[PDB]
């Protein structure tokens, strides 16, 4: 009832693109060994566990998550926290799912769509491939997504629209990946994405292998599904369910913009 | 101006939501990480620790609930010139609530273990919906001195008003119910949220580097363990109102 204590330094996994985990290459801890994205293993291994140190370092087995440099494309590696340049070891994990390096202003990124890829720092574009979620439990969050009036988001091939909520329908089960993508349980290769980065674009299905800023979303405290890059939210076209169309639109706060994760 | 009220006789997905938002707005002490938070207990004087809410069945039948502004808990209800406080209620509740009515004590506390115990039925088996709510108000407004039934009806009301205000998930479930014109029982995820309100509140407020200091475990429809550790985890959006724990800064 006074002030929260922040001396707690938790150790957790960091999931991202396609539900993979931030892994320390072949459990090799030699200064410079690159950091990559690997299958989150069944066991909670040290090379995939990180400690959110109070000085803003993210350590694994005593070494520091570090960027080779401050330029777009520079990869990130494991490195002795004392031997390294201090600025290259600091990271801010924002509430948006962005891991940013203060000194460079660049953000943790997974540019390769293939497991094993090395992580790098890049200009921040709030793309699916730059979205992360701390936590040992790195699995996608499966759940229903309820819009207004007894209506739930349903997958229809490569299209998505509303239908009366029915827990028996698999087409209404969604998988929200640690990278911010909302995927249809029946085909995790599909991802809800806007067609265009403009007001009015409809949300459709597209191959997640792209990992665009249009395939990343945050379930905001105001009940909306929000897109960082576009600064807009999922909205039921002119509050008319029959139009079988969910589009991008600026925040109004109306019922047709309210959603709820019904897991 | 006037106390928050819910006219069930003309309830709609819209009127119900308007009702809940007004209650949340009234209970909001501030905001932490964009999430509304109940007022800090060591900040409110006892004369301002309670608020009333009215639930009407018709233009001549309604009851009022007494709610502690500090924890969003229902501490009592009023029916006619009588009022009933949970056995668990502190001296201040009857001192500032229901003044003017004959006040009485209930033989059970306002927690779910006791309520379930006296209702001979757990939450998971008690139906929720518009027809249950209205049945309950009419039952409480009368005087049928049946504790088993009073506890059961109070379990209905607490979740449709109190939990509904705390969770965007609950109010959402109540709305599909109205739209569906079909009763429903809480699934294991609804109970998970009810049973985890306090630690979730503690988690959020202790957040550092977008991470909770200690994980918070939630249970879903399939009864699977969903272990949350991030302030930006989608499940956190189910929280509409937090219990106050600490102000972040240091
Ligand atoms: C994650 O797992 C590690 C190793 O099992 C454990 O030490 C750590 O505390 C866990 N993170 C939590 C529970 O916050
Ligand atoms: C998230 O990152 C910071 C702090 O959380 C904030 O300035 C930024 O605006 C956020 N991202 C958005 C909303 O684009």
Numbering used by the authors:
A (entry chain B): 5 to 267
B (entry chain A): 1 to 250
Passage from the reporting paper:
Ribosome inactivating proteins (RIPs) are enzymes that can inactivate ribosomes. The molecular mechanism of inhibitory effect on protein synthesis has been shown that RIPs act as a RNA N-glycosidase hydrolyzing the C-N glycosidic bond of the adenosine residue at position 4324 in rat 28S rRNA. Some are type II RIPs consisting of two types of polypeptide subunits, A chain of homologous and functionally similar to type I RIPs and B chain with a galactose-specific lectin domain that binds to cell surfaces, such as ricin abrin and abrus agglutinin (AAG). Abrins are potent toxic heterodimeric glycoproteins with an LD50 of 20 μg/kg body weight; while AAG is a relatively less toxic heterotetrameric glycoprotein of which the LD50 is 5 mg/kg body weight.
We have successfully solved the structure of 120 kDa heterotetramer agglutinin AB and CD chains, and reduced the R-factor to 20.4% at 2.6 Å resolution data. The AAG AB-chains are very similar to the abrin-a molecule, the structure of which has been described in detail. A conserved disulfide bond between Cys246 of A (or C)-chain and Cys8 of B (or D)-chain holds the two chains tightly as shown in figure 1. Two NAGs are found in B-chain, but only one presents in D chain. An AAG molecule is a hetero-tetramer contains two subunits, ABA'B' (or CDC'D'), stabilized by mainly hydrophilic and little hydrophobic forces. 22 hydrogen bonds between A (or C)-chain and symmetry-related A' (or C') were found. The active site is exactly the cleft formed by the intersection of all 3 domains in AAG A (or C)-chain. Five invariant residues (Tyr73, Tyr112, Glu163, Arg166 and Trp197) and five conserved residues (Asn71, Arg123, Gln159, Glu194 and Asn195) are located in the active site cleft. Docking study revealed that due to Pro199, agglutinin is unable to form a critical hydrogen bond with G4323 of 28SRNA, which is found in the docking result of abrin-a. This may explain the lower toxicity of agglutinin than abrin-a, despite of similarity in secondary structure and the activity cleft of two RIPs.
